[model samples]
Target: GSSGSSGIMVTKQLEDTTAYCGERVELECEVSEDDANVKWFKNGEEIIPGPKSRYRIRVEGKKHILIIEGATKADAAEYSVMTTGGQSSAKLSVDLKSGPSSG
Candidate 1:
């Protein structure tokens, strides 16, 4: 936000993903802000990792990453990340895979 420094700009976007049950799911994005704390959400709810968590949230420099291990049918949802400025979205779906071809 050079023109409007109050808000951060999402210079990049996160991409949606699909996986088969028992696989791992990951999504990542790069941002324009420095030393900023952002939040990750699933279906509009804040994400909190437990001690024996199945989720991994990371901030590697300008890179923001989210990962889900042991992907199953119930993990599918509309995922999003907020920079307290703007939010980027990426949907996750778990399925049987390769069965959607309309032949």
Candidate 2:
């Protein structure tokens, strides 16, 4: 019995939000591949391989994460991802200009 490589079923987590500043935001997702190459992008820019000042991506195996330190207004964008063949992309809003509410 000889068959080609296969991957795991990718899926997204059930989280609604992340912090706008002063913390690490965890973007969670899974891949069907036992070792799927996951990537992250902001708006439409792929995070570069070298950085220092404000943003960085911390990847753990098949989990894709993007961390923005001292997040600012520019850091606000709708984040999404592209998984394997049958996988879909999920999007969420990164609201950095909201304040307390009165009710």
Candidate 3:
């Protein structure tokens, strides 16, 4: 006997991360369903992974990853992933090493 509902679950969370300016940042998250479409966001702003942007989305089975190239302070923000099942989020902070850090 089970609920039999395909609810969403955050299998992996984006841990509090530290990245130096001009370095690559990768945030990974996953859901239970392999076929569910995952949408990503940064600071509540929807992120569309594309070539023109510094961000990219990579999906390997149930794992969905967000990769940022040459991460800058501007790239620092709350990152989230959503699917038909549910949503999961985490914060990202970028450090320049020359000045105070921002998250």
Candidate 4:
């Protein structure tokens, strides 16, 4: 008998979370491969890496983090992380702007 793991593996899965408007949202995950090229996606769209001033990504070894600054309702969506071997996703629910309550 032989047993071994190959390719990349998602060691940490993102969790569904909620954030208030105009707040920071951080989604993080860990991969089995330290050098794996992990890509982040939102709403089934790939997130391009650049200085967009809206989002940022950080990768350290097997750990990957996605940070969204000044999160708004438009930021709410299904976020996912994909590696060469596997992928994982979570839903991000955002709070609507708070205003005066109506009687």
Candidate 5:
């Protein structure tokens, strides 16, 4: 199933604890080779186009970046980066942990 590189790899991944709502976050991934198809998933389900529309991807140098602008609490979940060859993933959690008055 893999005609390209070693599937997908993440250069920078953070699923550690929590992310504040309404914060800008970046998720990065890497493929051993270029021109590899890339897709992202959440909770084993494909992230739909509209509910989380700010998601963007760009492959440059040796890394692929998945950037999400204005992150919200609803954006918290496990995420996976997949390609025709292989896949890599991480967990995500966003909340208003700072305080009810903080985002």
Candidate 6:
């Protein structure tokens, strides 16, 4: 029934998001295979999740999630996740609300 060989791949794409400074940001991407190894990246740099690290990388089944706590101006960048299937990326923009007015 199938034409070509079946290839594993990221089923869903991460969407670009916006967050306020000092807020938390979480991005998730879905994959077809659950056993695939996925790595997170920021600005061409690999994001290794750790307890002492500023970022949190988690995989609940086929869902790959990247969490950033207390997002600052520097946290605004293009975030991506790579795997044997393929790689997908999205942008994050931080809104500076340093002023008292929250308008």
Say which candidate scores most in lDDT.
Answer: 4
> lDDT values of the candidates?
0.80, 0.55, 0.80, 0.85, 0.67, 0.84
List candidate 1 segments past 4 Å from native. Answer: 1-4, 97-103
Stretches of candidate 2 exceeding 4 Å from the true structure: 1-9, 51-53, 84-103
* Count of clashes, each model: 0, 5, 1, 0, 1, 0
lDDT of 1 by residue, 1-103 (tens): 4344677767778787988887898887877776556788888999998678888887788787788988888888888888868788888989865555486
TM-score of each predicted structure versus truth: 0.80, 0.59, 0.81, 0.83, 0.69, 0.85
Which has the better TM-score: candidate 3, or candidate 4?
4
lDDT of 6 by residue, 8-98 (tens): 5788989999999989999988887775568888988998778789898877887878899889999999998888757899999999876
Q: What lDDT does candidate 2 reach at residue 19?
A: 59
Error of 3 at 44 (Å): 0.4
Task: Summarize candidate 2's per-residue lDDT along 10-94 as a digit string, tens digits.
Answer: 5654254445554456567665554566556666666564556555655677565656666555565655555455333434444
**In TM-score terms, which candidate is top?**
6
Cα TM-score of candidate 5:
0.69
* Candidate with better TM-score, 1 vs 4: 4
Which of the two, 1 or 4, has more lDDT?
Answer: 4
What would the per-residue lDDT of candidate 5 be over residues 1-103, giving only the tens digit for each residue?
Answer: 4464444554444344356888876777666666555777866887544555777766777567667777788777777877766677787778774545744
The better candidate by TM-score, 2 or 4, is 4
What order do candidates take by lDDT, descending?
A: 4, 6, 1, 3, 5, 2
Off by over 4 Å in 6: 1-7, 98-103
TM-score (C-alpha) between model 2 and the true structure: 0.59
Judge candidate 4 against the unseen true structure and give its global Cα lDDT, from 0 to 1: 0.85
Tens digit per residue, CA lDDT, model 3, 2-101: 3335876767766877898888999877777674568888888898767588798888887887899888988888888777778877877888778666
lDDT of 5: 0.67
Backbone clash total for model 6 is 0
